[PDB]
Every structure is written in structure tokens, then in C-alpha cells.
Amino acid sequence: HLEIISLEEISMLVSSDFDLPEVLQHVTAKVATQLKVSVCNIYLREGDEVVLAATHGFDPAFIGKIRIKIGDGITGSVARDGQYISLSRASQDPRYKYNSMLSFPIGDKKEVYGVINLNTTSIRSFHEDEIYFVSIIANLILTAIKLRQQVASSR
Amino acid sequence: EHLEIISLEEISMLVSSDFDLPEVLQHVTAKVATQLKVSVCNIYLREGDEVVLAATHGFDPAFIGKIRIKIGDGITGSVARDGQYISLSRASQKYNSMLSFPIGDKKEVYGVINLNTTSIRSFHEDEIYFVSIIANLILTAIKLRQQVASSR
Ligand code: NA
Ligand code: NA
Fold first, then answer.
1. 91-130 in chain A: CB under 8 A from chain B
2. Which residue range is the domain that position A89 belongs to?
3. How many domains does chain B have?
4. Residue B15: how many CA atoms within 13 Å on its side-chain side?
5. GAF domain spans which residues (chain A) (predicted)?
6. Partner-chain contact A7 B8, CB within 8 Å
């Protein structure tokens, strides 16, 4: 939402005394609650795949554990192509579900660094600026990485 | 605390692709001035043995080229050299209060952000914080633009 990011928040995000791990935990937990969604994950490009880096929705236990091969999911396509997809599906496993997800890339000019997902179990449309809001977050996340990775291991 | 005093596109432009340093700074100033309800906000950043004016709110923007301060020199010089910021009040005559805060990192000072009122007020712990934050924001606005350009 409009004026909806604390000074503490951008602060922590930029200021380098924190490690990605801890920021991203707070990022997902921020986004998930802001958009009223029941889970928000970040996967970060690593080799030809993409591994989980933060959650709000899963156990933190799952942090290293989930990997999507590159083109593989619809996460995997977002990771490959760098266009986000948002969809709602009707789903039914036999038994004598109607979810929504938003899957948005983290990337730049050159390429994709990761994917942020938002999944709610309700049938619900993602509104434009709802996506705008995540677009900004995808870029604050992009900026966290860039500051830390390069300006740390080379400065 | 630290109240919800920043805006999505403000944030955005800060980081953004083809949003541009002068212009970004020209807004950053105008925000601070307007926020801390201060008369002038000027950012000087670093060139060689001196520090030049990069953005103002409060002066004619025609002075952006034009004000260069040696690192030994101002109250602004000290802040630029030894990195730890200074804030003062003078009653001088009329009068003025000011905050001269550093922009930098563990090793290196990148410039100085400056506020002056033409009242006589000493700024709150919380008001400085804000500015410290604003100074990381400027710092990284800077830091991004040269890791993109000057390392590709
Ligand atoms: Na997911
Ligand atoms: Na000044």
C-alpha cells in the first residue's frame, strides 16, 4: 500500500550489518501480511536451479531444502523468462481446492537472480498495484543482493 | 518506533533503473526540507580534494555546479573529512541552526548532506536518525549507479 514501508524497514534492508537470510525472512513476512496472503516465498537463482531463501507460510526448516530446476515449475518459467505470471486455478484430487498465485522475478537489465511467490488458497484476483507493490519489493530485494554480494566480497 | 514516512515511488526512484542521480538527489533534498520542515537541504558529494554541491532544496538549483568546499575547510569540511557528523546553533547578530551529516561507509566518506533553518533549533535524536537513514539511501543510490556503470 501507498505510504506502507517503515523507515526501520528500508533501513535494515540497505544497512549492511544484516545478512540476506534475516532480511528476507522479514521481507516475506512483511509482504504476506501486507497483501493479506497466506504464504510468500523467495527463491534465489543458484546454478541451473532456484532454491528457497525465505518463507512466510512454510516452516523456516524448509529454507535450504526446496529446489526448483530452472524451466521446471511455473516458478521455473518465471525464473527463466523474467516475466511474472499470476494465475488462479480450480484443482481437485479424487475423494468420495481453488488457489491463486503470483510469481514475480527478481532481476535486472542483464538477468534474473530469483523469484518471489505469493500463494493464497482462496480464488482471488491479483489487482494491478498489488503487482506494483511486489514489483518494488522485487527491486528492493534485488538491491539487497547486489549491495551485499558484490560490495562485500569485492569491497 | 520510526513512523511510515516514506513512499513507494520515492523508495523506487531511489533504487530504479533509469532514474537519474542529479534528479533523484534534487528530490531527496526537497523531501527532507519538507519533512523536517527545514529552510534548506543541500547535498555535496566528493570530488578529489573537495566536495561539490549536488542537489539543493533552498538554493537556486543553478548553483549545483558551483559550490566547492575543500575537505579541511567548512564545518562542512570537517564532516567530509573525519566522517563523524556535527550539529550547531548560532545566535549570530537574526541567527541560524544547522546539521551537517556524513554520507559514507566503514572505510570511506562519500559526501555531506546539510540542513539549516534560520531559526535557532537543535535537532532531535529522532530527527537525526531520519537523516542517517536518508544518508544510507543517498549512499546506495550512489553505490548502485557506479557498480552498474564503473564495473560492467
Ligand atoms: Na512457492
Ligand atoms: Na549548505
1. 108-109
2. 1-155
3. 1
4. 23
5. 19-155
6. no
